[PDB]
């Protein structure tokens, strides 16, 4: 039923419009404005614990918007609650990574962080250049496809609504919804790209997205080793719940 496909597509596009931490309007106003040398120096002067806390807050803020995104997708809320929780726990950060690309400047390799754009050197205190580098490499690569907001909306929803997540009780229902989303995305892409393989290129990035997010988990585990008190009493409660 084509009416169903269009209804699903329109619903996801609308949710995306209303639930990104940064609207296209706000990104347009920022126009790639970067942090000053003074601000960059301040970030570099922060202790590892202090900067990690700030990063956890920004990441949690973005994750909260992904939860709102999911709540407004009719098909997502039709899934059993157990699976809704599993999809969000396992994929919220992956959606944040896709969204981060909207707030990334591929010309100078900077990302929007705490209101302005900053390069990888702004995160020196994290002691995790590999995570920053992998995240930035993915963003630069996704930006090369010049995706429209509708395409990002649909692709991000497919990343979230993944039938392959471990422990799902009704994976087939997730699969059926994801198939409808990809069918819609395939058609939307026809309006903006000559390469009829764009969808294939996007689907091929799925493992990379997961790899970057798993690296985030790895870094957090080591940080927890050195600063367990910070994570349990200073990090945002949701961040602790999702990544313990």
């Amino acid at each position: 039923t084509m009416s169903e496909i269009d209804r699903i597509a329109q619903n996801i596009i609308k949710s995306h419009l209303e639930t990104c931490q940064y609207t296209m309007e706000e990104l347009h106003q920022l126009a790639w404005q970067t942090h000053t040398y003074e601000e960059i120096k301040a970030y570099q002067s922060k202790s590892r614990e202090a900067l990690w806390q700030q990063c956890a807050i920004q990441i949690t803020h973005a994750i909260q918007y992904v939860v709102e995104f999911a709540k407004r997708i009719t098909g997502f809320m039709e899934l059993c609650q157990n699976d809704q929780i599993l999809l969000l726990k396992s994929g919220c950060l992956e959606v944040v990574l896709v969204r981060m690309c909207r707030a990334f400047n591929p010309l100078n390799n900077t990302v929007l962080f705490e209101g302005k754009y900053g390069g990888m050197q702004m995160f020196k205190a994290l002691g995790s250049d590999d995570l920053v580098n992998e995240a930035f490499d993915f963003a630069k690569n996704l930006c090369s496809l010049q995706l429209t907001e509708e395409e990002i909306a649909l692709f991000s929803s497919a990343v979230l609504i993944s039938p392959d997540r471990a422990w799902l009780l009704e994976p087939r229902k997730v699969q059926k919804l994801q198939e409808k989303i990809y069918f819609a995305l395939q058609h939307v892409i026809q309006k903006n790209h000559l390469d009829d393989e764009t969808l294939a290129k996007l689907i091929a990035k799925i493992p990379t997205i997961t790899a970057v997010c798993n690296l985030h988990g790895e870094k957090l585990q080591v940080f927890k080793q050195s600063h367990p008190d910070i994570v349990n009493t200073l990090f945002p409660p949701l961040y602790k719940e999702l990544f313990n």
Partner: peptide, 10 residues
């Protein structure tokens, strides 16, 4: 999943 559960239902 106390917090995630609360947000989902908020």
């Amino acid at each position: 999943h106390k917090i995630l559960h609360r947000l989902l239902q908020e």
